[PDB]
Design a protein around this ligand. Structure first.
Ligand SMILES: [Ca+2]
Ligand SMILES: [Ca+2]
Ligand SMILES: [Ca+2]
Ligand SMILES: [Ca+2]
Ligand SMILES: [Ca+2]
Ligand SMILES: [Ca+2]
Ligand SMILES: [Ca+2]
Length: 102
């Protein structure tokens, strides 16, 4: 199974968590394409110790709702996509993210 490419978009529009954003939910999004990445593959983010999970959509994108407070506590994390090939061999693809907190 071949790793693709995973990217994480800016954490909110300016890549900064402010006090309002920390108080609520924030959608963390990104892409997952290439290699053996497919729709339905799991996307795992560990943020401030909490594991957040979604799946890759039909267009190579993903989004997961995260506690803003977790993002205010943890300024760097990976998104890890687990994929399989046609024989069931598995592979993880990792993309990294950083942000700041106001
Ligand atoms: Ca912001
Ligand atoms: Ca944990
Ligand atoms: Ca971290
Ligand atoms: Ca597959
Ligand atoms: Ca960033
Ligand atoms: Ca500040
Ligand atoms: Ca400020």
């Amino acid at each position: 199974a071949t790793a693709g490419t995973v990217t994480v978009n800016a954490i909110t529009s300016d890549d900064v968590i402010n006090a309002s954003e920390a108080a609520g939910t924030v959608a963390v999004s990104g892409t997952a394409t290439g290699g053996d990445i497919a729709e339905g593959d799991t996307v795992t983010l560990e943020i401030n110790g909490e594991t957040y999970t979604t799946t890759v959509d039909a267009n190579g994108e993903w989004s997961v709702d995260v506690a803003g407070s977790d993002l205010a506590a943890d300024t760097a994390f990976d998104a890890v996509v687990t994929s399989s090939d046609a024989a069931g061999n598995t592979v993880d693809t990792t993309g990294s993210s950083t942000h700041t907190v106001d």
